[PDB]
């Protein structure tokens, strides 16, 4: 139950593009599929079709 | 010339208001308050962006 235990945390993926207050979801790019494997092991593909604007 | 003298002085006031307005030291109207997000939720990523133009 220490604070360094791996289960106590996770992985932090960060973007590189510093979108400003004026950047808006462009109609063409409105999807961010998240391919990942559940802690159980089952595979999940989360497609978040974002909303333009 | 008289009128201009006052207009110049008032021009200074406008700039002084902008360079002094501070919410506890965080100047608000010197173009330094770039868009900032204020968290308004118990879960993460629930923030609205507030921009204070110069």
Curated annotation (Swiss-Prot), chain A:
Quaternary data:
Heteromer of multiple flagellin subunits including FlaA, FlaB, FlaC, FlaD and FlaE.
Q: Could you tell me where this protein is found in the cell?
A: Secreted; Bacterial flagellum
Span of the entire protein shown here: 164 to 216 of 377
- Give the family per the record: Belongs to the bacterial flagellin family.
| Miscellaneous comment as given in the Swiss-Prot or TrEMBL entry | V.cholerae is able to differentially regulate the flagellins within the flagellum maybe to produce flagella which are particularly suited for motility within a given environment.
Q: Which domain of life is it from?
A: Bacteria
Name this polypeptide is given: Flagellin D
Q: What does this protein do?
A: Flagellin is the subunit protein which polymerizes to form the filaments of bacterial flagella. FlaD is not essential for flagellar synthesis and motility.
UniProtKB/Swiss-Prot annotation, chain B:
The places in or outside the cell where this protein is found are: Secreted; Bacterial flagellum
- Leader sequence segment: none
Coiled-coil intervals: 1-20
What's in the misc comment field? V.cholerae is able to differentially regulate the flagellins within the flagellum maybe to produce flagella which are particularly suited for motility within a given environment.
Q: How does it assemble?
A: Heteromer of multiple flagellin subunits including FlaA, FlaB, FlaC, FlaD and FlaE.
This molecule's function is given as: Flagellin is the subunit protein which polymerizes to form the filaments of bacterial flagella. FlaD is not essential for flagellar synthesis and motility.
What family does the entry list? Belongs to the bacterial flagellin family.
Quote the protein name from its UniProt record. Answer: Flagellin D
The species is: Vibrio cholerae serotype O1 (strain ATCC 39315 / El Tor Inaba N16961)
Which taxonomic lineage does the organism of this UniProt entry have?
Bacteria, Pseudomonadati, Pseudomonadota, Gammaproteobacteria, Vibrionales
State the gene name recorded for this protein: flaD
């Amino acid at each position: 139950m220490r604070s360094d235990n791996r289960m106590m945390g996770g992985t932090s993926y960060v973007a590189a593009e510093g979108k400003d207050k004026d950047w808006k979801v462009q109609a063409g790019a409105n999807d961010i599929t998240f391919t990942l494997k559940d802690i159980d092991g089952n595979d999940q593909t989360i497609t978040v079709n974002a909303k333009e604007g | 010339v008289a009128i201009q003298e006052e207009i110049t002085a008032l021009n200074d006031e406008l700039n002084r208001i902008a360079e002094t307005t501070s919410f506890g030291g965080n100047k608000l109207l010197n173009g330094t308050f770039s868009t900032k997000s204020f968290q308004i939720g118990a879960d993460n990523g629930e923030a609205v962006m507030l921009t204070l133009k110069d």
